[PDB]
Amino acid sequence: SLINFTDGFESTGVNQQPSGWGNFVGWQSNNPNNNIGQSVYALVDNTRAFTGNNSVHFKGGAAPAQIVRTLPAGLDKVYLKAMVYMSKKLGNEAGDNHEHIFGVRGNVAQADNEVRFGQIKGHVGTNEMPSDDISPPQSQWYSGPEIAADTWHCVVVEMLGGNRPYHQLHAYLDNQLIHSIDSISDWNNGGVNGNTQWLDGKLNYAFFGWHSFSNNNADVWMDDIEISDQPISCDSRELEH
Amino acid sequence: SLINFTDGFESTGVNQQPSGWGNFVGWQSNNPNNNIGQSVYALVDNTRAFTGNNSVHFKGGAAPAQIVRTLPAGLDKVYLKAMVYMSKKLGNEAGDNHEHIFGVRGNVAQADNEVRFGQIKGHVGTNEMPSDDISPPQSQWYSGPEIAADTWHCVVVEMLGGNRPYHQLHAYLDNQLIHSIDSISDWNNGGVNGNTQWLDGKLNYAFFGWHSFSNNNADVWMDDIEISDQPISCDSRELE
Ligand SMILES: [Ca+2]
Ligand SMILES: [Ca+2]
Ligand SMILES: [Mg+2]
Ligand SMILES: [Mg+2]
Ligand SMILES: [Mg+2]
Ligand SMILES: [Mg+2]
């Protein structure tokens, strides 16, 4: 196991970029103007949190607001996990293009080569660049499970790459499966241009934040972020029974 | 006096970025992957032109496709002019957010500090960043003169900065005035946060291409670009 990382943001000052992360803010990797005087930012906030005093607050829209972690070389799989609290919903949303909260990217400079989880065409799901292909197919658009605004959610994304006949992704909300990609028919536009191994070269950086391709501004808070190459799950506290 | 530049793209090979220019492609300055293999690019094209063999061809959308050039230190005003041919129109367009063809920017790496001329809220006009203000005001949105698709146009933008009480911008189509920013009431949202000197710091680079904030893909061709600190207008051949 090459990575087993957790961050509750408790050690960073309020209004500062999380210590130990990079950023991708307003389309620039490690934007030097990620601060409280800007309209788009990714900063520690002590006004909402799932555990302890602090979370990370993403304020963005069309312009992305993200924190970025470098992943170890040669991962075949990765698990991204966080407590997530959003100003708006994902899923079952008319007129959506696509929006995402979680992802991985191959090149730090670009949003050009990456896998993007949140919603596509108003269903919870995934956009890949550079194909710009989307999952699920048209059939399911503007429907399906909702990730509600204004409440804390335990979101896990499992990405299974490496030496397997078709690369997979499964997303879970409070430990319930909500979205899967496990064959080529799950994509709308012919399956990432025929490519069965569609996570190859994607697993270099992990990112978290807000990025709307539907022209929607949002405020998103996350806490207790985890990144691992072994499965991650949510505890009863996180499930909020 | 400080700049008098022209480019018809005739010396650059087809499918190559225009010689002597930088780029802003896919939100990256001097993107190394500005080439005919990509879905977003700014490349010389000999299949359409206004004069000679060649034009520059911008293919982009929400992801920008632009060529960029430095401007000399000290400019207090600039004129941007080009023959322009576009796959869609600007102006009189319901549902538009904003889209632009011409601009100037302060910092090469970002689209974060710049004046954007094309349409705002479906009326020919201007967006400034970082204020995100727009002109004209809301009374005129989704109306006004059209810059039509599928035909060659001569577009000129005058930007008047430096030591004057209020910075100004005037845009012209085939020598007819189509848009003006003369005073603070021309802005929708309070006038660039009350800054009268709103061109200051903006005249470091000129840029041209296609950049939509309305999620519209386009192809745009330009030729016979001029950039000067002295006025420019369209000649007899350009008016057609
Ligand atoms: Ca915390
Ligand atoms: Ca030419
Ligand atoms: Mg919950
Ligand atoms: Mg845990
Ligand atoms: Mg004409
Ligand atoms: Mg001339």
Author numbering:
A (entry chain A): 3 to 243
B (entry chain B): 3 to 242
Task: Give the authors' words.
We therefore set out to characterize two previously unstudied proteins from the shipworm symbiont Teredinibacter turnerae that were initially identified by the presence of carbohydrate binding domains appended to uncharacterized domains with probable redox functions. One of these was TERTU_3803, which contained both a CBM10 and a CBM2 domain attached to a range of distinct modules (via flexible linkers) that did not bare any sequence similarity with catalytic domains typically found within carbohydrate-active enzymes. Using a ‘module walking’ approach, we searched for other genes coding for these X-domains.
In addition to our work on Ttpf08450-X173, we produced TtX122A and TtX122B, representing the X122 domains from TERTU_3803 and TERTU_2913, respectively. The electron density was readily interpretable allowing two molecules of TtX122A to be modelled in the asymmetric unit without breaks in the chain representing residues 3 to 244 of the protein coded for in our construct. Chains A and C had some areas that displayed more disorder, so there were breaks in the model between residues 190 and 192 in chain A and residues 162 and 165 in chain C. In addition to protein and water molecules, two magnesium ions were modelled into the electron density on each protomer in TtX122A based on coordination geometry and bond lengths [Fig. S4(a)]; these ions presumably bound from the crystallization medium. The overall structures of TtX122A and TtX122B reveal that these domains adopt a β-jelly-roll fold [Figs.
